[PDB]
Amino acid sequence: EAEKAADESERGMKVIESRAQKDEEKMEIQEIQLKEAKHIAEDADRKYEEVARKLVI
Amino acid sequence: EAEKAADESERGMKVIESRAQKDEEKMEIQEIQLKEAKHIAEDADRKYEEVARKLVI
Amino acid sequence: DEDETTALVCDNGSGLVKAGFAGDDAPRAVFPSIVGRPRHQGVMVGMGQKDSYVGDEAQSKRGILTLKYPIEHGIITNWDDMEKIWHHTFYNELRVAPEEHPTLLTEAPLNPKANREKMTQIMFETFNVPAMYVAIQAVLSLYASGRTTGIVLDSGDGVTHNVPIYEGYALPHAIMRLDLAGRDLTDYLMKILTERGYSFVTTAEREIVRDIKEKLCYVALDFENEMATAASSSSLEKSYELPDGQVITIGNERFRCPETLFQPSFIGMESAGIHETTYNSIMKCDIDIRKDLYANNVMSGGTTMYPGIADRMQKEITALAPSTMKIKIIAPPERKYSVWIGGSILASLSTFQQMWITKQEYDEAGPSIVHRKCF
Amino acid sequence: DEDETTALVCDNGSGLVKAGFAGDDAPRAVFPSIVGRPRHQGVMVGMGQKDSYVGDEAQSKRGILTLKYPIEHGIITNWDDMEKIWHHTFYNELRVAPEEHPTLLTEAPLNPKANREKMTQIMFETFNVPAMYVAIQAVLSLYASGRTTGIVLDSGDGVTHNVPIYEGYALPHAIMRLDLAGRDLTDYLMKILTERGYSFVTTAEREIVRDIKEKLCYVALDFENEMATAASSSSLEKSYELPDGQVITIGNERFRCPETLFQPSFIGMESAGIHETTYNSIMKCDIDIRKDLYANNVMSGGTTMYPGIADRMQKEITALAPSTMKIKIIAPPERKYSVWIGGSILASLSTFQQMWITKQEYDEAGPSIVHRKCF
Amino acid sequence: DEDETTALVCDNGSGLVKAGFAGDDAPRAVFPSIVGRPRHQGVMVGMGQKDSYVGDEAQSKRGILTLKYPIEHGIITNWDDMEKIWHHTFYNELRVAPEEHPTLLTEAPLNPKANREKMTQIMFETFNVPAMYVAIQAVLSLYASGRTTGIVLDSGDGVTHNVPIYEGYALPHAIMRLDLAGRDLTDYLMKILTERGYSFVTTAEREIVRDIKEKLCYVALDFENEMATAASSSSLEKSYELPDGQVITIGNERFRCPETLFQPSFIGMESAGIHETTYNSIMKCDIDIRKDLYANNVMSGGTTMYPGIADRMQKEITALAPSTMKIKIIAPPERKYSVWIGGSILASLSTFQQMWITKQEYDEAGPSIVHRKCF
Amino acid sequence: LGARAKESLDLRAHLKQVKKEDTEKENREVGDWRKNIDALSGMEGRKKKFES
Numbered sequence A, B: 001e002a003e004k005a006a007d008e009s010e011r012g013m014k015v016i017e018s019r020a021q022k023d024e025e026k027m028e029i030q031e032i033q034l035k036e037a038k039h040i041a042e043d044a045d046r047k048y049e050e051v052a053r054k055l056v057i
Numbered sequence C, D, E: 001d002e003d004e005t006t007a008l009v010c011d012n013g014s015g016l017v018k019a020g021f022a023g024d025d026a027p028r029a030v031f032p033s034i035v036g037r038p039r040h041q042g043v044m045v046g047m048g049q050k051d052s053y054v055g056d057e058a059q060s061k062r063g064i065l066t067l068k069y070p071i072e073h074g075i076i077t078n079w080d081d082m083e084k085i086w087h088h089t090f091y092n093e094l095r096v097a098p099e100e101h102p103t104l105l106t107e108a109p110l111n112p113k114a115n116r117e118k119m120t121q122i123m124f125e126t127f128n129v130p131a132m133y134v135a136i137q138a139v140l141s142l143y144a145s146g147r148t149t150g151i152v153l154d155s156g157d158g159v160t161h162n163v164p165i166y167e168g169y170a171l172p173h174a175i176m177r178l179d180l181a182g183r184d185l186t187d188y189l190m191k192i193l194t195e196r197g198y199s200f201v202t203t204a205e206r207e208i209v210r211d212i213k214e215k216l217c218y219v220a221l222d223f224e225n226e227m228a229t230a231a232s233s234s235s236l237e238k239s240y241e242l243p244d245g246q247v248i249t250i251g252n253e254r255f256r257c258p259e260t261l262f263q264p265s266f267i268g269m270e271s272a273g274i275h276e277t278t279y280n281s282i283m284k285c286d287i288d289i290r291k292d293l294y295a296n297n298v299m300s301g302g303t304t305m306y307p308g309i310a311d312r313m314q315k316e317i318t319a320l321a322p323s324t325m326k327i328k329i330i331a332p333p334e335r336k337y338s339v340w341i342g343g344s345i346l347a348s349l350s351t352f353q354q355m356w357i358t359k360q361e362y363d364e365a366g367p368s369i370v371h372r373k374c375f
Numbered sequence F: 001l002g003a004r005a006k007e008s009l010d011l012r013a014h015l016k017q018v019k020k021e022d023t024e025k026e027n028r029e030v031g032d033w034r035k036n037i038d039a040l041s042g043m044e045g046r047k048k049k050f051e052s
């Protein structure tokens, strides 16, 4: 009985590890998306400042 | 041996479950931040384009 | 694919390929002209194991591939490479079949006539494009500027060309090609960085240092005075954050790299700076219109995104030429796409289909027909 | 035996032999690589009187046998020993005949080519395996991780190997073998326990002290500070119950034993810690991908069951390398079977039987054919 | 010390230091650039207990010392190491005081300018040399050959440099450095010997295997055909007697080790063989003189004592270049001293003291004066 | 960006699924079977042999 219980617990490990790893994949996806968004925003702000300076001149 | 293994697996249960829930929380935080960043990027694009049209004039 | 049979517009610029549909404002598929190949042989299985890698795929796989250039300064290495990259562009990137759309292409100035005949023949046999037209990028940049008078400085990645065109008329007698381009810039910067303590040979660092040129480089207003004040220059010295995370600091080199085009004697060219090449070009033609050439100079190319070319250009030409008339340069933002825009402009009007190079003309007269059909 | 002719999967790891059938999740017959020989001669009768003792039989008969290692750090002593242990594994432990099942084997990294040629020849002559394939354990651990990018730290019982593989491509130019392994760990612990008052030489106590390493050993977060606080450390000091029943107490030694791999100067190696060997390995290859290597490091081996390798690993690499990108180690539980799992993975797919090393190829080209058939 | 105030001539070649007096034919104190340090700490007394060990002392004490390289491929680790080794050379080996003799030094091609400024500053502060001059080893080897036209292949122990010089003029635009050198040779031979059954990591075996390279190594005329005939090759296979007395037999490896410089793809370099690097170097410069470069190529370095470089060199260049003009290599025996000989040649003439770098110039303009005083 | 993420995660999931296939094939037939010692009480005391 005890060994069977330990085996079902081992299956618990497997499926919870699967949950953790799918979560970690989504973590990488959304963090990369955040880097890309912030980099594009900064570049657009710099372009806006440059074109404002050009307009003034 | 079986009892100690089961107890070790219980410790793992709680550790990994918590890890997963924390990841889900992080997911939500990253999601709202990404939405805000996308909004800001669209804003900056619009601003720059309007300034460019005025510049061309 | 659009329901209409509109033409394909593809700029195979010396350094960048920009392709899309006619009637569009910007090219859809734009990629650098680098081509990666497996550095080693195949023993593994389950994924990859593909020979040609092009576009962003090769950009991501730069480290594992020998990075080779199918074209350098116009010279063609292997037509199979162009075959594969055009396949990729048309089907994997443009999602278009060339059967139902004629192609307008742009070629580097003064490209070999034998090169044109071979490329057109392999094209027509390999592909099934209905009709053809190829034009020099000079008149394309002219069209982007929309002014028939001016001298075009086309600064590609293999050659820099100076071409004068007055009232929409080419002047081949006053057109010149200079072997200074991005390649030289990277090389010179490589040797200076070697003298700064960092010595790399591979192409990944080539792209890193051209990115550095895109971001931080200056065009010195006065050269030796700026190195004299750049001796210490804590504020003037500028740093970059390399993707590995190390901070690499560069000072005078920022404006000592593009200066080499202006001062070729640094690495040994008989030809003087490109401003001298525009000057001689101008005087070769009749005196009178030269003033207009002074006032209507245009510059085109991806390099033009850098600062400092305009001020240096005008000041040196005014130093060389009399300062009575005012000289002013014109350069629209994002002009590296401008050539492709001009291609769309060519497809805009309804007279363009009068001189499409159809399949049957090539079948009748071979490739030789282009000798009479384009010029 | 299964009704199907599925292949044999056998990992002859340097320290453990794990054998079973293809399509299985875990190896069926797993035994340490110790071999016991009668310590004295025969005068008695009625039982025993058998030369070779392998597996759990020798584990039970450790005291009566001279315990010898047929392999140490890859070097082969006597092929007859492998012959007997493979006979035992196939027939007494796996209950399988190698006539009807091809064998996939894993070998220690950078094993001698002459060793491969002799072992394959004796194998083919002695046994009747239909087909063959042998692979490096590095790519097997990679397959177990299922990620084509990373640097594998294979910590066997004779050698520790650092091997970088980017996008499923081996990098032999940046692969190194270090002579520190379980043997060294046991030796160093033996001398420290000798300084603790307990001095043993025989192999039974070797297994006892490696069991102690499995159970109680630490990896010190800070070394000299932890011995300074381990001066008294009534709580931190830990005890073990030896099978004879005596209570043996050990304190700082728990984390002063694995530290020697990290600090080889304790017993005199020119090479620095294994983290330095991973560091140099990383920089030998192009700069750019190094960050990915930092973020994709994998560790494999039976030793990995100990705590403390992960935290020490990351902290020291972050100390050596810039701390911009986050470094994280991955290590699935029970990874010492992982190599064998990868072997099963190799037999899963239907392309694997395209390059089975059949009998007739070996009969044609001798052993030399493997020089062209594996690599 | 000579009664006359003649100058010091010191070649700090990348791999060997050769020092002596001006007007001498050969350097007096010649030692390899290895530096040994105590592998352990001090507890004994009565003898030894000295930190730095240099020269033949370290050669005799190789086993007890961690052997470290103060310079590798030009990069400088610790200036204190150079301080000590120069002290040893000047006083214990040359028995000379640098106060009364100006020094002529040779530096590796394209050495860092920051390296030059720091080394000169520490030199001038630490030492009391009256005057200074430092030159590139390329023109020194040219002087040893005594012919102003040719391309110099400097094969040091850290870098191999190809430098073209026409009519006694440097061509930096066509000069390249390749990271293949003795270190690579030893490494590659180490891995092949590992595949032969002998796996060593320490530096003593590094020196043993470089000695093997000095004695037995071939340069294969045809590569794959020679391994094909070297399959058995009882006569062609050659043996060495290691100082411990064991006989170590090597066959194809003799000509498979230097081949790696010619075939870098063996251990993964994008750059092709060094003959390609001489070829590209030649074409970079004007076409016309290229024939003279073909006919005037010179090779220099300690490695040049090996056979086979000349025949391979000429055959491959003739394969690459048209075979109209006859290509012939020149290489005087014992050319590793040749650079130092050229240093003596520099001190021979009475114009050399017009541009000695005196103490007061450095005191006025700091190290920066060398930027204007040498070049 | 979504295409890059999809390609990476799809390769990862492909290697994950190939790894699952081996576990799907068999999961229990790798372990050995039960042979514990118990009972035997009914056996006789005077063994037919003298190791009694």
Ligand SMILES: Nc1ncnc2c1ncn2[C@@H]1O[C@H](COP(=O)(O)OP(=O)(O)O)[C@@H](O)[C@H]1O
Pocket (backbone or CB within 6 Å): C012, C013, C014, C015, C016, C137, C154, C155, C156, C157, C182, C210, C214, C300, C301, C302, C303, C304, C305, C306, C336
């Ligand atoms: N956004 C950018 N900013 C600065 N330089 C750029 C940029 N994009 C491309 N370049 C430079 O432009 C060069 C390519 O020139 P290209 O535009 O292909 O010439 P052409 O106009 O003849 O096609 C590259 O070498 C690169 O260094």
Ligand SMILES: Nc1ncnc2c1ncn2[C@@H]1O[C@H](COP(=O)(O)OP(=O)(O)O)[C@@H](O)[C@H]1O
Pocket (backbone or CB within 6 Å): D012, D013, D014, D015, D016, D137, D154, D155, D156, D157, D182, D210, D214, D300, D301, D302, D303, D304, D305, D306, D336
């Ligand atoms: N359950 C365990 N816990 C801790 N250490 C173990 C365990 N099983 C084996 N080991 C250690 O692993 C070593 C054998 O390594 P091994 O896995 O054979 O290397 P490889 O991966 O190269 O085959 C043994 O010396 C032993 O000390």
Ligand SMILES: Nc1ncnc2c1ncn2[C@@H]1O[C@H](COP(=O)(O)OP(=O)(O)O)[C@@H](O)[C@H]1O
Pocket (backbone or CB within 6 Å): E012, E013, E014, E015, E016, E137, E154, E155, E156, E157, E182, E210, E214, E300, E301, E302, E303, E304, E305, E306, E336
């Ligand atoms: N007598 C010799 N025979 C063969 N090779 C030698 C001999 N002496 C030195 N070498 C090789 O020359 C290398 C050192 O090159 P070196 O002459 O210092 O280069 P450089 O000319 O740049 O100073 C050593 O690695 C050694 O292997």
Ligand SMILES: [Mg+2]
Pocket (backbone or CB within 6 Å): C013, C154, C155, C156, C157, C300, C301, C302
């Ligand atoms: Mg251009």
Ligand SMILES: [Mg+2]
Pocket (backbone or CB within 6 Å): D013, D154, D155, D156, D157, D300, D301, D302
């Ligand atoms: Mg292992």
Ligand SMILES: [Mg+2]
Pocket (backbone or CB within 6 Å): E013, E154, E155, E156, E157, E300, E301, E302
């Ligand atoms: Mg040399």
